[PDB]
Amino acid sequence: HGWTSMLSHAVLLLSCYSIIIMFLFILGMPTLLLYDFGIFFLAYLKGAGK
């Protein structure tokens, strides 16, 4: 992050935003995966009922 020292008043501005970006899109990866499974998404996770 050294090359961004003069781009703002915070040296870690890009790092502080990226940790939030990394959190939000990683949190959305499982959500989009269940959407891809469809209505059967529970059978993809646990399998058949008992």
Binding site: D36, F37, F40, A43, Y44, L45, K46, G47, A48
Partner: protein
């Protein structure tokens, strides 16, 4: 041909080369030694998913 690789977004080096000799020279000591598969596009995704009677689709 370099513009064709760029305009079709085939920006994985050596993907369309039958013998990616440059890819072998770069991975002579790489972990999990492998070269890119032939004509692999960086956007294609052939992942599947199935639901079985057991958990985790097993």
């Amino acid at each position: 041909e370099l513009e064709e690789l760029t305009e079709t977004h085939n920006y994985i080096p050596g993907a369309k080369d039958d013998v990616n000799l440059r890819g072998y020279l770069a991975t002579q000591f790489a972990w999990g030694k492998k070269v890119i598969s032939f004509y692999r596009h960086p956007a294609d995704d052939f992942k599947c998913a199935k639901a079985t009677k057991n958990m985790l689709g097993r």
